[PDB]
Design a protein around this ligand. Sequence first.
Ligand SMILES: *[C@@H]1O[C@H](CO)[C@@H](O)[C@H](O)[C@H]1NC(C)=O
Length: 399
Amino acid sequence: SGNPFQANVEMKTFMERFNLTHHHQSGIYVDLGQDKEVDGTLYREPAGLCPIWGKHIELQQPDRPPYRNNFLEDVPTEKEYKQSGNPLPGGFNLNFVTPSGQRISPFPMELLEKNSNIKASTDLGRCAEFAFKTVKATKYRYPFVYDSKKRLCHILAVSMQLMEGKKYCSVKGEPPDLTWYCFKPRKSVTENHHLIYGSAYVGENPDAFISKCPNQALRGYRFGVWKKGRCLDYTELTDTVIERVESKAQCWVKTFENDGVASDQPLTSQASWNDWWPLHQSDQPHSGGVGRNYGFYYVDTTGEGKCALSDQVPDCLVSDSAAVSYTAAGSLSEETPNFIIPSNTPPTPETALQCTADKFPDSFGACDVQACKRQKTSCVGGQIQSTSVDCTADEQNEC
Ligand SMILES: *[C@@H]1O[C@H](CO)[C@@H](O)[C@H](O)[C@H]1NC(C)=O
């Protein structure tokens, strides 16, 4: 009878957007899928094509001045690090100033929107284009953070994303001998949803991410894989991790902070006070975006908020009007926000899940005799429905 989310061009192109292995093509928790040579040494470089919503690097600095514990503060100056002693004060922000003595980052969006050289149609893409178009003279492309609330575009001099261990870096000052404070990738239930992280390469095709990335939570559907002639949401799969959550927010954080998330990160040196970029290592992994990136919040039959998490690139959806499907790349929110909608170039449709009952009639599958359930695909108040129901009484003789 067919997988309905595949028996259509419109469906296909739409299910493709959640496929992070396809367009994003790189680590999400850590993103370092490319190499680039600078001053004769080979460094890792972020390369993912998709923007990562809510992602910030949490620092672990001492809780005393001069330490701000915010990665959007400037990379420190030599003088500032002379004054502070170990570990480094400051944040990850590029702090270069042009010859004119004008400042690179953070850079105002109002300036970008009125620049012809900036050919992107959306504010997020403009920042991205700017990241991509601006790097004593190198070919390295810094990753960037768009502060979408302050409309400032940040270029990040530091590409490192994760450092831990008493062998590498200090935590809150301890041990006190270490040059670097530790830091990791974070997503928070409450903090910083308005920051967007990305490799420069989001900017090469500054409009592409609009339809090739899973930017938003998908409200009212669970990620699923087509099997045994029906859509199996992750709960029905053996490889899936399921964790009890208190709010749909924790689930979303989990799709990004779980152990299996696409990660391009066992370092082999104490970074110098000045090494803003990971070194290329012989055995470095490139995830390509393969990972436990996918997940949804649902409530089970007993009233519990749960969180299914899978590494299976989904190819069908199970309707569940309470559910929200998250990935590592996109936002908690499910509303297209103003900064990825052209300022004007008409918007690109996703009508892939709109329907009428007349042109979209109840279609039933054959009986999965192992689960004694069958696919039913319908249209209810203008939206596609996809669930696994009871077989007929007849078919039941076979389970
Ligand atoms: C996702 O994309 C990759 C590479 O483009 C592909 O090999 C894989 O089959 C895709 N997974 C799907 C469509 O479920």
